């Protein structure tokens, strides 16, 4: 059973998700338009500050509290959930966990308050996201950094409220490039299978200059810093993917009670009711998986293995429940007007981002000695 503080938050975000987020989800998906009005209301709720102390502007909660919110948002609109997830985990977290009093005090308050978004630029075109692959070069001249390179698939990097993008550059540490830096160009959005409302851009740097004080962490330790906070993001996206799986149940249950076939609701036929029952089982064990992962994290125990399992299994519950949810909806399962249709498109990236399934299996395998 969930404690009051967490159960109260779950109820508030879920209420938010049904009353505020769901009515506009179809519009932003069709338009590919970033939901600024939803992000600002999430910011005023403090969701962007949940896993941060009131010191730097956060709400003094934890990552499990954020996880509960992401599950409730994931049920309804993945683009909104991933904007929150990526903002906290990829924008603010590298600055909060590796930035001095000045860096944290300059950038975090806006990020933590939902007034601004930050992104992390690691992936590059043609590069294998390894340490060996990073072809983006950075050179120090006096009190300013000079960056030359290109990044690919960077979330939250080109909104009207993006303040900075922390990037990786071979010198390899983490450098905070404010948006508006002359060499910093935000290329146009991608045409993606899904997450249509989520902001995603390629980035290019031609002799961009930023202050010396913008180095994130110690010179040479930025990639190591990233790996050390990856595990919280596996939990966060496991919760998002779990919400997706549950949203697919919820919609399919709703749809099965309305839609008729040969005089009875389609849920009266075992093939539909059993398929939905299995979907609810998948979502449930996905939820116990990431609760267990968060429990270890909050207790200070190791949670890398549990998070990797939680993320893989969750992502598979979302994909499987989306394919089943669209089957339950029939022709409507092929119409972007219906939530489960958008979930079918959106969920493919859940098996790929935050470490591919193959990466999670490698981690689990190494944990056994293989």
């Amino acid at each position: 059973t969930l404690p009051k503080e967490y159960q109260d938050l779950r109820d508030t975000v879920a209420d938010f998700a049904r009353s505020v987020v769901a009515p506009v989800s179809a519009k932003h998906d069709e338009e590919h338009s970033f939901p600024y009005e939803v992000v600002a209301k999430m910011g005023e709720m403090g969701l962007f500050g949940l896993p941060f102390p009131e010191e730097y502007g956060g709400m003094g909660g934890d990552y499990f509290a954020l996880a509960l919110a992401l599950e409730e948002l994931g049920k309804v609109d993945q683009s909104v959930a991933i904007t929150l997830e990526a903002g906290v985990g990829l924008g603010a977290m590298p600055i909060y966990r590796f930035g001095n009093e000045e860096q944290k005090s300059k950038w975090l308050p806006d990020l933590l308050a939902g007034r601004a978004l930050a992104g992390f630029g690691l992936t590059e075109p043609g590069a294998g996201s390894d340490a060996g692959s990073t072809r983006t070069t950075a050179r120090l001249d006096g009190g300013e950094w000079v960056v030359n390179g290109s990044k690919q698939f960077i979330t939250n990097s080109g909104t009207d409220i993006t303040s900075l993008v922390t990037i990786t550059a071979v010198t390899i540490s983490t450098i905070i490039v404010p948006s508006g830096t002359p060499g910093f160009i935000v290329e146009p959005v991608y045409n993606k299978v899904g997450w249509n409302a989520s902001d995603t851009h390629p980035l290019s740097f031609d002799d961009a200059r930023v202050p010396e004080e913008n180095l994130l962490g110690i010179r040479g330790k930025g990639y190591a810093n990233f790996l050390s906070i990856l595990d919280e993001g596996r939990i966060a996206i496991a919760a998002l993917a779990t919400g997706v799986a549950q949203g697919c149940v919820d919609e399919s249950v709703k749809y099965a009670k309305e839609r008729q076939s040969f005089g009875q609701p389609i849920g009266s036929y075992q093939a539909i009711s059993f398929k939905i029952a299995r979907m609810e089982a998948r979502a449930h064990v996905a939820r116990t998986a990431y609760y267990e992962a968060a429990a270890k994290m909050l207790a200070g125990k190791p949670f890398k293995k549990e998070a990797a399992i939680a993320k893989m299994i969750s992502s598979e519950a979302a994909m499987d429940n989306a394919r089943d949810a669209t089957q339950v909806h029939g022709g409507y399962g092929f119409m972007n007007e219906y939530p489960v249709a958008r979930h079918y498109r959106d969920s493919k990236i859940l098996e790929i981002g935050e470490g591919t399934t193959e990466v999670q299996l490698m981690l689990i395998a190494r944990s056994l000695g293989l």
Copy 2:
């Protein structure tokens, strides 16, 4: 081994698919634009007339030749493949199989030559596509049919070359009425925002007192739904072939991508996790292909092929869905980008489990064939 005539057609459509269809596939998907220039090239190739006798403008072939062509188109662009499949199976076939000499001579030559497209309007909003569910009424007043109702998810019903849409209508007496496009009560509503098949033409249809000549009654008064039920199996074979091509296309792309893309100094195809996944993908497409070849073989021998087609369609559609999820995995982040074929195959393929009889409907048929 495949006989010469069929291997020749397969090779020609494959060249067509790689040289003509693929280069423009990305533009049409992004734009949601109907590929008129591709449909015109398919029409001159004879593909819309492949299973129809020369008398009406056809090529004197069969549904297997059409299935071979659909597999090659499915590899590359599902919207183009389903435009052909629906044009033949739902546009020309109901007029060729149940229309009199006049109906056939007036409508088939343009359809069979690809100069026009035809649609079949059965599904309605709120209805379970049964005969008991058909709320679209058509009323005889003098010498004209007066139709009031609405159809949903009708393919090929609103292109610049759509000539007619045959609909099912209560007259529970259910007949089929040929509604030419341009009929005053006939409104083609705006396109749907669909998960996939972005380039394929799909519309809701509405009829507010549309009047058409009495000679437009297709088949016997009251037997139009029954006639539709009787010719369904060829389309199951046709779409199993399309889904088989999708499954194969996902393999082809993943193999090329796996040989180029690098990870830790070796192409990702050097790792068993990728190469075994692609090998399994290739196994799925192969047995899907043997399944629908057998269904067509029985059809061509004049033997029963309902059960074999139902299996071919189910297994094929699942090979497409599974191979699209694996192919996008192999492509990594690129698998989430509509510029890549496999990403479009992941979106497009979901309707393959739903149309031409849902998986649950195929399982029902197979079950009944066993005595269940």
Copy 3:
């Protein structure tokens, strides 16, 4: 994280499982011989008394404590685990939860101490285990009950230490038939796919007489009593099935480090190491599933839905991990000498007993309104 009391018990039974149970598992499986020496040592540990108060002879623990023990035993030998599971859940539990001070004081102390075993006879040949199907008739004459009928697949019903079999009989309540009752005949064991060492018998009753005081619960309420304690058994077998899944990982990990192919251990090839990594994920989420189920039960909250999901998912983790574990072992996967081979045979019944998968899906479906 697990509290000390539970973690201590988990360590003791696991130690028991490796040192006492595993050395004799192959012998009893080959011989189809009931492991009396293992059952007596489990009894002296008090495992048969774990979910019962010290009052009636039990150890004053809970069903979760029993669940932890069953997982550790399930890892090694299903026949031993199911003997414990069925003894507690089907022998003692109907008497503990529905028997008067005298009935509990007469029978439970031996059951709870592992000195005796009791079974539950509900299934009948040709009957669908519904209330409508029970063709076994019972008639009251004076101070004795007279029973006529036949039962099928009754666990623990014909060992040298079986004291009684509580049965269902249409009159429909629960009647305690002591072993040795003249009309009570124990037919010979079945040749089963698996659980070779587990005791299983058809039962036949031709005018057997037992005292009036032997009525279990109220006349007419015995089947209702059974349904009301079914949910604890779903948790118990979910834990057993989870242990099986983990045992298959453990053995496959052990085997993958020893067995060579083309100069390297077979776990160096991704196809083997990834398959084992997935197996560990299945066992892990099965374990979070039934922990969650037990948590609700111990808190007094409803746990029927959670138990049904836990049992289904667990049983599927055992079957899937057994098929993968035998693949990892190659030809040895087809040899009853190896634990994972016995797990492949044994696990089929996990999808069937304690409510079939179809029954669990029906329950989950009804919980959603379908």
Copy 4:
């Protein structure tokens, strides 16, 4: 449609399987007793001589005819089917394909007529079945080969009618030596306690200074493992057919059981959960059958069939495993009772994913065929 000769054989073996093999299948499984009376009846039917020319005692048929027969035997009893499959593929075939005129005339007539059984001893304890792993040495001393080593999991190597066991031996020069049974150093160790195939004869073999004539060298000195690798594909087809029969047998049994067994007043086959599961089972067996038919068709046309056989074998073995797990589910508690065919199919089928090249080996082959 199947040609007359093949349909005739299929019908005959099917009658055999239902009339002769099935009634005794339960007794042999419980007893672990080799079915000599079944093997003698198969021998007089010619099944062990089906793919061998008349000259050596065979029936002048092919491996497809044998595959058809194995599918019918697999439906009913896998131990009987694998006795035939291993007898032909591992006993007679290596002598027919690589032995001189004398070797063939001395050993093939009894094998091809079922009066004797032969085994192939390659696998050894601790070895990865590679040539580099073969630790069994055979030494030429005067005119006799002196063999020291051990073989593991050797089918048909210890029956009352086993005549010989061909083994692989280091001479890393690897040759094949024909060891007749009764040779002084040749010890047939006691049977294994196996998960399934309880009635099929399986033994570890040990050689402590066994001497056999020099004329027993099979093939060229040093080429015996290479020869074995070259004839593997026919056995993949043969066992895909066996696994296909297993898959079909599980359907057949589940259909009969589903029509009789009741639940809440209707047979369990009236519920979609059971009828759809059985319909899917039927789909799996059908596409498995189309897969291995295509592999055999290519083989018979003289075309490459390695890739097609590998797919047929993998997909077949998985159809058997999946259908056995579903069929035992349909049978409920009875699915856990060795008296029922599907329960025995659940135990027997696991080795179908492991023998005749593991699933991982088939995926490797398919992958290599794509350039991976």
